[PDB]
Ligand binder design. Structure first.
Ligand SMILES: Nc1nc2c(ncn2[C@@H]2O[C@H](COP(=O)(O)OP(=O)(O)NP(=O)(O)O)[C@@H](O)[C@H]2O)c(=O)[nH]1
Ligand SMILES: Nc1nc2c(ncn2[C@@H]2O[C@H](COP(=O)(O)OP(=O)(O)NP(=O)(O)O)[C@@H](O)[C@H]2O)c(=O)[nH]1
Ligand SMILES: [Mg+2]
Ligand SMILES: [Mg+2]
Lengths: 166, 166
């Protein structure tokens, strides 16, 4: 069956893993649990096609360097996550975008900018900032909350259709 | 506030109106009620931006001709709906696509192919057929059910982000 090799990328503490686990296990993880590397496979039906989603949940900070080079070359599409109440996480998005471009030899790699934690009133990144960024990269911008499940299948299905249309 | 002028297009009986009403009024219309022309405005928040959705729900069959020319030139983006248990409705999609192209003077107009009634086991249009069609047009393909609300905000938000990225 069709498999789509997805990787969730972004700064430490932005909700990469809580996003991933709301999709696969249907619940919010409210605690401190930093990732090294975690892999999830789930058979799912998207727009009538049977497929398997093979998600690689990555570390934010780490000694991950060209140890990131390795998962970035096998990933077919990328969720690039930041948190809307953390301005620094938003500036680091550029970092992840160029390093993805570098290793894939491509300027057009399947990608969606995800602004997570939208349930929180304490926003420091305006939607318009991120909308314009995502438009400069030729990329979709979707806001999510791993807390309320607002936008999580959206962000992930949108990325599977980007890989389709590539 | 930003307004997005959306129009729902497609053959008679495909679920144009039940799709529209599940979005705006949160319920399934199980009856016979053909449309002439209906308009819906709703203030909504998509990906943190405040916007108003101005949806034009159109007639499928009619004496609608260049009386369709008029709403097709003011529409910013189009949902092109067919039903997955009606092969003829799927072949007519081409009709609506060329006439949209003609009046907008454009080959790149915001559009998403929607395959509705996916809750029904009695499919005559395979997902792969429609996936390939939608890929030949450079367009997203999303399946919906106005009955279960499966995919309806998806199909509509996807089209608002196409207008954004245009
Ligand atoms: N309110 C709110 N909190 C969230 C959301 N997503 C994650 N969190 C909280 O943010 C914290 C960090 O989440 P986690 O998913 O572990 O983030 P990470 O990006 O995976 N961190 P790491 O890079 O170290 O692996 C946790 O306390 C989590 O409960 C969200 O959408 N909203
Ligand atoms: N099972 C199922 N039935 C649906 C769905 N969408 C619409 N229907 C049924 O299909 C019939 C026609 O629906 P309607 O929404 O009126 O279609 P239309 O495309 O708007 N028709 P018209 O072009 O004449 O205006 C109704 O009986 C409706 O209840 C769906 O997703 N699933
Ligand atoms: Mg993590
Ligand atoms: Mg109707």
């Amino acid at each position: 069956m069709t498999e789509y090799k997805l990787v969730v990328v972004g700064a430490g503490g932005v909700g990469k893993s809580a996003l991933t686990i709301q999709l696969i296990q249907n619940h919010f993880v409210d605690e401190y649990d930093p990732t090294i590397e975690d892999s999830y496979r789930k058979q799912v039906v998207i727009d009538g096609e049977t497929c398997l989603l093979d998600i690689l949940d990555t570390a934010g900070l780490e000694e991950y360097s060209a140890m990131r080079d390795q998962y970035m070359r096998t990933g077919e599409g990328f969720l690039c996550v930041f948190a809307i109440n953390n301005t620094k996480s938003f500036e680091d998005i550029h970092q992840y975008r160029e390093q993805i471009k570098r290793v894939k030899d491509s300027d057009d790699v399947p990608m969606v900018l995800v602004g997570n934690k939208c349930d929180l009133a304490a926003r420091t990144v305006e939607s318009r900032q991120a909308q314009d960024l995502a438009r400069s990269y030729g990329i979709p911008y979707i806001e999510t909350s791993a807390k309320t499940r607002q936008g999580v299948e959206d962000a992930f299905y949108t990325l599977v259709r980007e890989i389709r249309q590539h």
